[PDB]
């Protein structure tokens, strides 16, 4: 199993040069996308019985 | 020796992702109001199989949808007048799921069998008939998707995701990497890239063009069951037998949100998010699904409505609409 | 748009007319989950009595269609999972192994106490009764080297052994049975049982034992339903 | 002061009746053939109780019937009509029980809803047809020694088939019962207790109730002691509490029609 | 994540004694039942041992009964293997096992070749 331990490490070695930014920074992004497209979501916001077509 | 760099590299990247966090989302998210308290009824529920469903996919019309039944049938629906439109009777009864083609001309299901079959639903003499079957994985097709009509990708039990092309039939890559069954499968708005779950609780993001994982992501306790991007897709869900839901993003690298309760002991089945990413829906095993607020972890609301095992949570695109299915044969819509 | 609805509406009854006739056929037939080991003797059993493997046999006006499930890897965490609604699982025993017995013993435990795989019956099949009596009588290997408890088992009074078999053989046949039976009455419930078997390579009896054991499983279902047992 | 028991009796016949038809008609997990028998001996119960009963409720105190001679003929058949279908109906559902428990491996193919459709609808025909063939101050059903014997012989047909599958039952109960002990004697008994007390229960709800109105009618017209007619009014109220007893019986006692609910 | 490593073994004279270790990290030890299995040289994976949650209930191979005994500390989140009156076909290599899923009795592909909740083993030889 040489190579298979052998190809792990470098797999896990090819990944640690990853760019990374900053947990908060997504947590913000997450956040402001979430606002941003909240009020067109019909699950959000209660989708008046008129135009909903689950009459 | 080499496991003694292999576990010091480790420990290397788990410092690293250490230093990285400096706020949770918690915090941060705490600020905002609470969603509220969300409750849907059915609008619609739809019967006709006759064993338990495993799987089932809108279309990107948020008209009509598939779904798979283990009595070897895979069903079209009309969502909005409970008609149905096609029913296709399968060679394998144990399917264990099934894709409806973005374009809407396809659908695809496998399972079991080993074999992914695809059918066309728009022949010049109308009927339905089996358009092509892709072989080659040596395991059970946990989930299958469609980049477009002659691209799909599909995750088997041989502990291998695997992309086709439809025309030539054979997989044009095959993404390697997990230690267990691959279990769940979800794709990118871009359509460029990939993240999938296994039982190793491990999941793996893969670009489609490169053939290589390009993050790992791990943190679940147990096997991973379900997984889904976020709407904008630098995020994703996954649901395992933990009973807990987890959320990481790409670019951080980490688990941000986990969703737990003391009460629920029973592992996630599916997940699956809303148009605008803020509710969380998971369908759990004690026969009823939660609605969690997605940013604030909360439990906004409860989809009690099947007599068994819920086995596949959908979205519509338009974001109107909730199916259900499970082990009950009944597929019931939300709003 | 009338025309759209009507069009619609009629594609959906000559839908329903075809499921109608299909849940007919599919309520008829029962499906049984064949388990067994590499040593156990299910290829030999299947073949006698015809990816997956699909079989299917039809006595007394009953089809059933065994799934022996051959393809996939060693893990059966997750594929097992399909087959909650089987009828039975014919589980199948090299009991003649002596040495991959208690991997037998431990998947019917995983099996009896599966969340899923609970309310199924197991019917146990006990293959190579032929090689146990023969190891018994060679006396080259000695089955309490592998199971302690056997050297204080007693054969039950409710014991029928078979004209001309030696007691060792009934002995030693019989500790095998309740080796199992323990792990199934161990946790039950009364929502299902095991049916042990005593059967040969060269036993051509076997698809009337399946009938019969599965004409008891309804029977048990529909008494339990009507509160009669 | 009797009002007080028939009018709870007839509560009964009519409130929770229809949480069995709307109950069977709408819920489309219970759509079985086993179900439709079940609903329609639930509906002739209901109608027993909406037609013919509130009719006799304040006119069996009141000692005469004031409505008239088409009242009378129209409150007569429904009742002969109505009681006999409900009959026929747990004779049927009866054979349904045997059908499932002996040979059950076999059950879907021969008793399919087409088959529970033709017996509902022989059941119903027999009954109406029965009625009207031998019915068409006070009304009182002419003995003359000879209507007694076809009343209670179209009685005594379904009974005998009805007692005897449900003993047949009980034997296969006890077969069954006894494989789980000997497989696996107070154990085995406490099994046959309740297999017989459920057996018991849905026998005497029939047999208890019909019975003691055939054996009054019996004795007053071959003895010769003439019963009081106020006796025969608590007689006929109990033969009809077994349209209250039938939803009891047979949907409430069962877990399944709880857990439906 | 999940990660169990073993301890302890090694080379003992027959009829000694051992004390085998498995430190576990990364889940919640004291919900799921513990097995410890072992790989003999040129056999296949064999089950040895398992000890449910609170260990109310431990189980042991036929061959091992009465002189191994299992036990488990979720205090300090071990598990443990008293290795006494060793015998030549006991060398091997020993794996701790994690059960699949929490609150579950039954535990299935312990045995598998490529299981995902198993540690790297000790040798144990005599
Ligand atoms: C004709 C002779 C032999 C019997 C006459 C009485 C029966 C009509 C009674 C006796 C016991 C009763 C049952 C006793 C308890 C229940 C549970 C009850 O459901 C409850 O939740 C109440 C509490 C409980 O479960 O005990 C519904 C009615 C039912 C089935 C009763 C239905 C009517 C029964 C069968
Ligand atoms: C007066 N009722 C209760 C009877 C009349 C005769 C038939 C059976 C019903």
Same mark, same amino acid.
Request: hydrophobic share 40%.
């Given at each position: ?55 | ?335 | ?72 890897? *060693? ?102 049975? *309740? ?23 060269? *036993? ?26 | ?261 | ?126």
């Amino acid at each position: 199993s040489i190579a298979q331990a052998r190809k792990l490490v470098e797999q896990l070695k090819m990944e640690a040069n990853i760019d990374r930014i900053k947990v908060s920074k997504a947590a913000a992004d997450l956040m402001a996308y979430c606002e941003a497209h909240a009020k067109e979501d019909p699950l959000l916001t209660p989708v008046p019985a008129s135009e909903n077509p689950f009459r | 020796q080499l496991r003694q760099e292999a576990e010091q590299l480790k420990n290397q990247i788990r410092d690293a992702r250490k230093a990285c966090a400096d706020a949770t989302l918690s915090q941060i998210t705490n600020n905002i109001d609470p969603v509220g308290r969300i409750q849907m009824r059915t609008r619609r529920t739809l019967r006709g199989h006759l064993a338990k469903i495993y799987a089932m996919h809108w279309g990107t019309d948020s008209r009509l949808l598939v779904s798979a039944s283990q009595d070897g049938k895979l069903i079209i629906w009309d969502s909005y007048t409970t008609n149905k439109v096609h029913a296709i009777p399968l060679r394998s009864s144990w399917v264990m799921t099934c894709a409806y083609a973005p374009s809407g001309n396809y659908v695809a299901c496998g399972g079991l069998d080993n074999i992914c079959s695809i059918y066309n639903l728009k022949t010049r003499e109308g009927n339905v008939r089996v358009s092509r079957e892709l072989a080659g994985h040596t395991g059970y097709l946990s989930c299958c998707r469609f980049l477009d009509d002659n691209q799909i990708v599909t995750s088997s039990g041989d502990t291998t995701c695997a992309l086709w092309d439809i025309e030539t039939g054979q997989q044009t890559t095959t993404f390697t990497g997990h230690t267990g069954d691959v279990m769940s499968l979800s794709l990118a708005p871009d359509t460029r890239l990939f993240v999938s779950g296994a039982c190793d609780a491990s999941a793996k993001l893969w670009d489609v063009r490169e053939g290589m994982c390009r993050q790992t992501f791990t943190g679940h306790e147990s096997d991973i069951n379900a997984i889904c991007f976020f709407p904008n897709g630098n995020a994703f869900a996954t649901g395992s037998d933990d009973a807990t839901c987890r959320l990481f993003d790409l670019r951080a690298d980490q688990e941000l949100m986990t969703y737990s309760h003391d009460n629920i002991i029973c592992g996630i089945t599916s997940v699956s998010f809303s148009k605008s990413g803020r509710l969380l829906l998971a369908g759990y095993d004690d026969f009823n699904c939660n609605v969690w607020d997605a940013l604030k972890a909360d439990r906004a609301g409860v989809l009690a409505g099947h007599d068994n095992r819920v086995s596949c949570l959908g979205v519509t695109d338009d974001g109107m609409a909730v199916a259900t299915g499970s082990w009950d044969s009944f597929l019931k819509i939300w709003n | 748009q009338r025309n759209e609805e009507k069009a619609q509406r009629e594609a959906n009854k000559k839908i329903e007319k075809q499921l109608q006739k299909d849940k007919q056929v599919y309520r008829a037939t029962h499906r049984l989950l064949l388990l067994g080991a590499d040593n156990s003797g299910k290829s030999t059993i299947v073949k006698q009595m015809r990816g997956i493997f699909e079989t299917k046999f039809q006595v007394d006006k009953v089809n059933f269609h065994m799934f022996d499930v051959g393809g996939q890897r *060693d893990e059966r965490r997750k594929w097992i999972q399909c087959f909650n609604d089987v009828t039975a699982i014919i589980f199948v025993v090299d009991s003649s192994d002596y040495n991959r017995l208690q991997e037998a013993l431990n998947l019917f435990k995983s099996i009896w106490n599966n969340r899923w795989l609970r309310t199924i019956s197991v019917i146990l099949f006990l293959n190579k009764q032929d090689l146990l009596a023969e190891k018994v009588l060679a006396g080259k290997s000695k089955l309490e080297d592998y199971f302690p408890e056997f050297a204080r088992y007693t054969t039950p009074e409710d014991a029928t052994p078979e004209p001309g078999e030696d007691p060792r053989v009934t002995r030693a046949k019989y500790f095998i049975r *309740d080796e199992f039976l323990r792990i199934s009455t161990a946790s039950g419930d009364g929502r299902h049982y095991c049916y042990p078997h005593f059967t040969c390579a060269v *036993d051509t009896e076997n698809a009337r034992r399946i009938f019969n054991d599965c004409r008891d499983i309804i029977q048990r279902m529909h008494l339990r339903q009507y509160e009669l047992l | 002061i009797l009002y007080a028991v028939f009018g709870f009796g007839a509560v009964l016949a009519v409130c929770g009746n229809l949480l069995v038809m709307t109950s069977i008609l709408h819920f489309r997990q219970l759509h079985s053939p086993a179900n439709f028998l079940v609903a329609s001996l639930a509906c002739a119960d209901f109608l027993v109780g909406v037609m013919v009963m509130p009719f006799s409720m304040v006119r069996s105190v009141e000692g005469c019937w004031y409505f008239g001679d088409s009242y009378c003929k129209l409150h007569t058949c429904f009742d002969v009509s109505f009681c006999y279908c409900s009959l026929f109906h747990l004779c049927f559902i009866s054979v349904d029980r045997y059908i499932a428990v002996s040979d059950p491996l076999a059950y879907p193919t021969r008793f399919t809803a087409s088959v529970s459709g033709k017996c509902i609808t022989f059941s119903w025909l027999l009954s109406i047809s029965y009625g009207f063939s031998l019915i068409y101050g006070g009304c009182q059903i002419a003995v003359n020694q000879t209507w007694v014997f076809i009343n209670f012989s179209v009685f005594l047909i379904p009974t005998l088939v009805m007692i005897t599958v449900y003993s047949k039952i009980f034997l296969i109960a006890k077969q069954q019962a006894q494989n789980i002990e000997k497989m696996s004697k107070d154990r085995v008994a406490k099994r046959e207790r309740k297999a017989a007390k459920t057996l018991g229960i849905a026998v005497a709800a029939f047999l208890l109730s019909w019975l003691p109105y055939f054996i009054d009618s019996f004795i007053d017209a071959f003895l010769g002691f003439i019963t009081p007619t106020y006796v025969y009014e608590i007689l006929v109220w109990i033969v009809y509490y077994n349209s209250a007893m039938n939803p009891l019986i047979y949907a409430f006692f069962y877990p399944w029609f709880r857990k439906a609910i | 994540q999940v990660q169990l490593q073993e301890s302890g073994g090694g080379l003992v004279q027959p009829g000694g004694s051992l004390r085998l270790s498995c430190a576990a990290s990364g889940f919640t030890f004291s919900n799921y039942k513990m097995n410890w299995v072992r790989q003999a040289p040129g056999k296949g994976l064999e089950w040895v041992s398992d000890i449910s949650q609170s260990g109310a209930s431990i189980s042991y191979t036929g061959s091992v009964k009465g002189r191994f005994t299992i036990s488990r500390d979720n205090a300090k989140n071990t598990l443990y293997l008293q290795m006494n009156s060793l015998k030549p076909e006991d060398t091997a290599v020993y794996y701790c096992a994690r059960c699949p899923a929490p609150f579950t009795r039954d535990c299935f592909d312990v045995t598998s070749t490529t299981y995902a909740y198993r540690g790297q083993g000790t040798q144990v030889t005599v």
